[PDB]
């Protein structure tokens, strides 16, 4: 499908040569308009626009296109600025992204001080958004000085494209930025400014991006207080519930902000939102994943999600979902990828009987051992207290790899199980507060009769032997937490 | 092919005898011209010039030819110096190199102070450039005092041949010199003076050697700050991308600076540039390797690369390349040697399924066990956490040699894998900052639940058992690094 490359690269080289030869303002503007048209038609090329646009961006990278665009962007006249920034925001691929991070930092901030031209402001917002898509060190250095002031000022504006770009930029800050970056942004009242934007009924896209940024901020368990004080959290769920993934898929074809799909890096960033223990974050992540799933199915690719690994997260959500809209979104996405829909699994693992054990074993595809469990009368308690030796000898799992897979499944089930039948001190809640996966040990401690009050007097040997916590790091963390009452 | 040897040895002996008998300036000049012509025709002898020139250099080494040239180079008249140095730069093989390093230090420097004669300066630059190929202590001593000033002054000159000699000299200083030598050169503003040279569009060779020196300096992670402040880094990639190795091969036949190939030691120095973790350095290394591959294939030698080991680096680059220019260069170089081009492997190693495992196993040529991997349902997580005993028993690799080979392949894959799916504290980035190979351990730490923040509270036993870091030295280094936050 390189015919388009042979169609565009000669014209692109000619246009780049003209742009380098363009010393006059009119010639600069004409060349910038031509290259902008070329990159736009490359982007909108049906079902193949992404890779051809990336190739055009690479061809711009050679011949020093980036420095030429920066040079034209430093010109006194605003026409050069607007045209150059319009071109640049379309071509800010990861390679050009890091090149700008290395070289062009500081001029972009200075021209971002030019908040008055809204037409320029939209393009500058796109530039800084794509910069936020870059690594975290760039996030601190840019967001600290040029980020919050410019993004908040343009959020206070009313133009739709600028607000949409600002919301996307804030979402990228929340995703690629560190917990310190999110903390600083939250302290900068960013959520409070986003609250009208998410409450702005005009555009669904702006509200969606604002909800995404709010959810990613809520993933930080240190600033969530003022985050929920913003009130957007109670707004996130009704919005995602009201919207239709199929409707969103049919739309955005005309408004091609994401019509050509979304970068695998962006989806990889989104995936952690599923296992975030925050219902709004999981809702918005599921909605985005379902929308991108529909878009890719229209394009005809589903392997990218498996490469990212969202399949496992979605299936775990389906098996361990209590909400209705989360279940609907996950099932719809899985059916969009042409994947099986697992039946929800009964959470009362401690009270499980043989039927539940057989069902769960068949669900993890371990039928070869099912009868043995049925032979051994395995129930919830025994399954929860199952050990390596018992699995190997009594149940005949003589291959270590199979035992490792079984213990991985058991770890997942333990982490996402409800122990309300047995515990009474909410030891599971405390362990999850320390770390989600720590919940895997909860029943063991319950099997030991340990209590929160008694936790400060437990020992390492008691943890390893009685509680069966094989990992030394987890034992050390638990002991350190328990020593502090 | 000793016919050339018996053609040259008697004539060379006669010329050496005449030069020894030459007391007058005119006789000295005549003898020097004759021996220079002989060594020139010996070097340019088709496809066999190297060994015959080496034999001529050995014949000069005997009969005190080196000390005769030194004494003539100590003469008052400039003509004798220029002729003697013209001969010497051609006859400065490694043996003559070390002899001059032992004996002729300081007189060469003193005549290098005579920077005014540009024709003499060319030969002096050649002498010092070849001298930089010697050991690092000699490099320290001689480069520290005379080399820097002479090369900077001659770079300030306009002679293309002198400039090319200086660029090659700086590249040799960067390669053969130690980290202290590189630091001293960087402190001498070397890259800043190189910037106009690389920016001088006239000579492709001069720009290429300047970019080579810049890249080798950039391999140092202590002084790269001012190196990228020089600005040549943004120019390195366009140069290598624009040029064609075939163009470099068909050309330079007349300008026989490298038309007879390059010393295997030089290629051995070049190979580390491929695994230098810096895109520009790998680009220039790949370009040089492809050019030398073309030259050798035209000559008909490919085993030299296997002896040097560039095949492994090229294949690792091809498998684990994200850039297009590097991929194209490495693929073309491998096709020059008639070696298979491996298919690039999916970087999302944690998210691999059975098909990816089968593909990777077939790529490393471990087909004999693929079905077993299929039988045990090994996936990315299991493969990354696979142990010695599990491999030996479950997968039936009873021969420890095969297990060591498989674990070496797994170590390489881990070092070059992408863990962004699993980790979130960028622990891989920190480990690579400590040491690239340390990246192999990252997943294990991720499997242990360890992050950057808790790194300072890990212990040796936790590293050995939970993280499975078998090497005690690596464990000690990681613990020491973690103790310092
Ligand atoms: O996520 P990616 O594409 O690697 O990087 C973002 C860059 O791509 C352009 N873009 C992506 C998608 C669809 C359209 S119309 C345009 C953006 O303008 C930005 O420059
Ligand atoms: O070749 P090596 O061992 O890297 O360098 C040793 C000597 O060979 C001469 N030489 C080799 C080949 C082609 C020409 S024109 C010249 C150089 O003058 C150098 O002093």
Rg, chain B, Cα only: 27
Dihedrals φ, ψ of A74, to 5°?
Answer: -85, 5
Contact (CB, 8 A) for A390 and A373: no
B238 at interface of A, judged by CB pairs closer than 8 A: yes
Dihedrals φ, ψ of B451, to 5°?
Answer: -130, -175
Dihedrals φ, ψ of A133, to 5°?
Answer: -65, -15
- What CA–CA distance (Å, rounded) separates B58 from B72? 19
- Neighbouring CB atoms inside 10 A of B354's CB total 15
Dihedrals φ, ψ of B104, to 5°?
Answer: -80, 15
How far A63 CA lies from chain B's nearest CA (Å)? 6
Determine whether the shortest distance from the Cβ of B277 to ligand 2 is under 6 A. Answer: no
Contact (CB, 8 A) for A22 and B198: no
Contact (CB, 8 A) for B349 and B418: yes
- What CA–CA distance (Å, rounded) separates B140 from B242? 36
Q: Which of A144, A112, A110, A115 minimizes the C-alpha distance to A128?
A: A112
**Chain B environment of A62 (Cβ under 8 Å):** 237-238, 241-242
Residue carrying the six token digits 């219902």: A279
How far A179 CA lies from chain B's nearest CA (Å)? 10
Contact (CB, 8 A) for A452 and A428: no
3-class SS of residue A479: helix
Apex A29 CA angle, A24 and A32, nearest 5:
120
Give me the residue from B351, B448, B454 closest to A309, CB to CB: B351
Determine whether the shortest distance from the Cβ of B271 to ligand 2 is under 6 A. Answer: no
A401 at interface of B, judged by CB pairs closer than 8 A: yes
Contact (CB, 8 A) for A72 and A80: yes
Tokens representing A415 are: 């982490």
Query: DSSP 3-state helix, strand, coil percentages of chain A (rounded to 5)?
Result: 75, 0, 25
Find the residue in A nearest to B394 (Cα).
A399
Angle at which helices B25-43 and B3-21 cross, to 10° = 160
- What CA–CA distance (Å, rounded) separates B390 from A378? 27
Q: Which of A327, A345, A231, A338 minimizes the C-alpha distance to A287?
A: A327
Burial class (CB in 10 A: 0-12, 13-18, 19+), A160: middle
Per the annotation, binding residues of A for NAD(+) are 43, 50, 89-97, 130-133
- What CA–CA distance (Å, rounded) separates B423 from B403? 28
Resolution, angstroms, 1 dp: 3.5
C-alpha B263 to ligand 2 mean position (Å) = 8
Contact (CB, 8 A) for A209 and A217: no
Contact (CB, 8 A) for B336 and B297: yes
Handedness of CA B17, B21, B24, B25 (dihedral sign): positive
Determine whether the shortest distance from the Cβ of B129 to ligand 2 is under 6 A. Answer: no
Residue carrying the six token digits 């074809």: A253
Burial class (CB in 10 A: 0-12, 13-18, 19+), B467: buried
Q: Which residues line ligand 1 (CB under 6 A)?
A: A 43, 89-94, 130, 256, 260, 263
Q: Which of A329, A341, A428, A447 minimizes the C-alpha distance to A387?
A: A447
How far B419 CA lies from chain A's nearest CA (Å)? 11
3-class SS of residue A431: helix
- What CA–CA distance (Å, rounded) separates A64 from A58? 10
**Chain A environment of B448 (Cβ under 8 Å):** 471, 473
Tokens representing B158 are: 């306009």
Taking an 8 Å cut-off on Cβ atoms, the answer to whether B377 and A63 are in contact is no
C-alpha B108 to ligand 2 mean position (Å) = 19
Burial class (CB in 10 A: 0-12, 13-18, 19+), A110: exposed
B463: number of CA atoms within 13 Å, CB side? 23
Burial class (CB in 10 A: 0-12, 13-18, 19+), A471: buried
| B330 known member of a binding site | no
Longest dimension (CA), chain B: 87
Q: Which of A205, A231, A202 minimizes the C-alpha distance to A218?
A: A231
Q: Which ligand is nearest to the CA of A93?
A: 1
DSSP string, B12-69: HHHHHHHHHH--SHHHHHHHHHHHHHHHHHHHTSTTTHHHHHHHHHHHHHGGGHHHHH
Handedness of CA B216, B221, B225, B228 (dihedral sign): positive
Give me the residue from B228, B241, B421 closest to A308, CB to CB: B421
User: Which residues of B, range 358-377, sit inside 8 Å of A by Cβ?
Assistant: 376-377
Tokens representing B434 are: 């400590």
Angle at which helices A49-61 and A94-102 cross, to 10° = 30
- What CA–CA distance (Å, rounded) separates A68 from B482? 44
B453 at interface of A, judged by CB pairs closer than 8 A: no
How far A197 CA lies from chain B's nearest CA (Å)? 29
Contact (CB, 8 A) for A5 and A12: no
- What CA–CA distance (Å, rounded) separates A462 from A440? 17
Q: Which of B38, B92, B262 to mutate to test the pocket of ligand 2 (most atoms within 8 A of CB)?
A: B92
Q: Which ligand is nearest to the CA of A91?
A: 1
Contact (CB, 8 A) for B384 and B414: yes
| Residue whose CA lies nearest to ligand 2 atom number 8 | B90
Q: Which of A96, A122, A130 to mutate to test the pocket of ligand 1 (most atoms within 8 A of CB)?
A: A130
Q: Which atom of ligand 1 is nearest to the CA of A92?
A: 20
Taking an 8 Å cut-off on Cβ atoms, the answer to whether A58 and B324 are in contact is yes
Taking an 8 Å cut-off on Cβ atoms, the answer to whether B238 and A64 are in contact is yes
Taking an 8 Å cut-off on Cβ atoms, the answer to whether A271 and B421 are in contact is yes
B433 at interface of A, judged by CB pairs closer than 8 A: no
C-alpha B93 to ligand 2 mean position (Å) = 7
Q: Which of A382, A380, A381 minimizes the C-alpha distance to A390?
A: A382
Measured between alpha carbons, how far is residue A76 from residues A19, A28, A31, A327, A424 in Å?
Answer: 17, 13, 18, 55, 70
Find the residue in B nearest to A470 (Cα).
B466
Contact (CB, 8 A) for A264 and B322: no
- Neighbouring CB atoms inside 10 A of B471's CB total 13
- What CA–CA distance (Å, rounded) separates A317 from B64? 84
Q: How many helices (H) and strands (E) does chain B have?
A: 31, 0
Query: DSSP 3-state helix, strand, coil percentages of chain B (rounded to 5)?
Result: 75, 0, 25
How far B466 CA lies from chain A's nearest CA (Å)? 6
Contact (CB, 8 A) for A213 and A233: no
Contact (CB, 8 A) for B139 and B176: yes
- What CA–CA distance (Å, rounded) separates A485 from A452? 8
C-alpha A130 to ligand 1 mean position (Å) = 8
Q: How far from chain centre, in Å, is Cα B392?
A: 39
Find the residue in B nearest to A272 (Cα).
B421
Q: How far apart are the first and last CA of chain B?
A: 64
Tokens representing B306 are: 């296997």
């Amino acid at each position: 499908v390189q015919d388009a490359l042979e169609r565009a690269l000669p014209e692109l080289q000619q246009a780049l040569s003209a742009l380098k030869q363009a010393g006059g303002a009119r010639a600069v503007g004409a060349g910038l308009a031509e290259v902008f048209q070329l990159v736009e038609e490359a982007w909108l090329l049906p079902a193949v626009g992404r890779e051809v646009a990336q190739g055009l961006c690479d061809a711009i990278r050679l011949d020093g296109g980036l420095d030429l665009l920066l040079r034209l962007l430093q010109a006194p006249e605003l026409e050069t600025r607007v045209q150059a920034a319009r071109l640049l925001e379309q071509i800010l691929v990861a390679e050009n992204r890091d090149r700008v991070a290395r070289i062009g930092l500081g001029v972009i901030l200075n021209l971002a001080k030019e908040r008055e031209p809204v037409e320029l402001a939209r393009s500058v917002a796109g530039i800084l958004e794509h910069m936020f898509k870059h690594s975290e060190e760039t996030c601190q250095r840019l967001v600290a000085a040029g980020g919050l002031d410019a993004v908040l000022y343009w959020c206070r504006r009313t133009d739709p494209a600028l607000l949409r770009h600002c919301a996307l930029a804030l979402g990228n800050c929340a995703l690629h930025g560190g917990q310190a970056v999110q903390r600083r942004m939250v302290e900068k009242r960013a959520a409070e400014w986003l609250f009208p934007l998410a409450f702005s009924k005009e555009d669904e896209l702006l509200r969606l991006h604002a909800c995404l940024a709010v959810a990613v901020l809520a993933t930080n368990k240190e600033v969530e207080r003022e985050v929920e004080r913003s009130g957007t959290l109670a707004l996130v769920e009704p919005l995602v519930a009201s919207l239709d993934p199929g409707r969103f898929a049919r739309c955005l074809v005309d408004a091609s902000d994401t019509s050509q799909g979304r970068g695998p890096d962006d989806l990889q960033r989104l995936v952690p939102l599923l296992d975030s223990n925050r219902l709004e974050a999981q809702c918005i992540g599921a909605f985005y994943l379902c929308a991108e799933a529909a878009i890719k199915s229209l394009q005809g690719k589903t392997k990218v999600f498996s490469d990212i690994g969202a399949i496992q997260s979605l299936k775990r959500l389906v098996s361990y979902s209590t909400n209705g809209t989360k279940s609907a979104l996950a099932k719809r996405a899985l059916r969009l990828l042409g994947e099986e829909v697992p039946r929800p699994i009964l959470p009362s693992v401690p009270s499980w009987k043989e039927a539940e054990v057989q069902t769960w074993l068949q669900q993890i595809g371990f039928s070869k051992y099912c009868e043995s469990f049925r032979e051994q009368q395995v129930d919830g308690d025994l399954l929860l207290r199952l050990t390596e030796e018992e699995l190997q000898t009594d149940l005949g799992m003589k291959s270590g790899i199979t035992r490792k897979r079984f213990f991985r499944e058991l770890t997942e089930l333990k982490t996402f199980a409800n122990y309300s039948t047995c515990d009474r001190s909410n030891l599971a809640d405390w362990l999850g507060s320390l770390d989600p996966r720590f919940r895997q040990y909860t029943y063991g401690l319950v099997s030991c009769g340990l209590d929160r009050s008694l936790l400060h007097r437990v020992s390492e040997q008691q943890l390893l032997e009685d509680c069966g916590i094989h990992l030394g790091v987890h034992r050390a963390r638990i002991l350190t937490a328990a020593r502090e009452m």
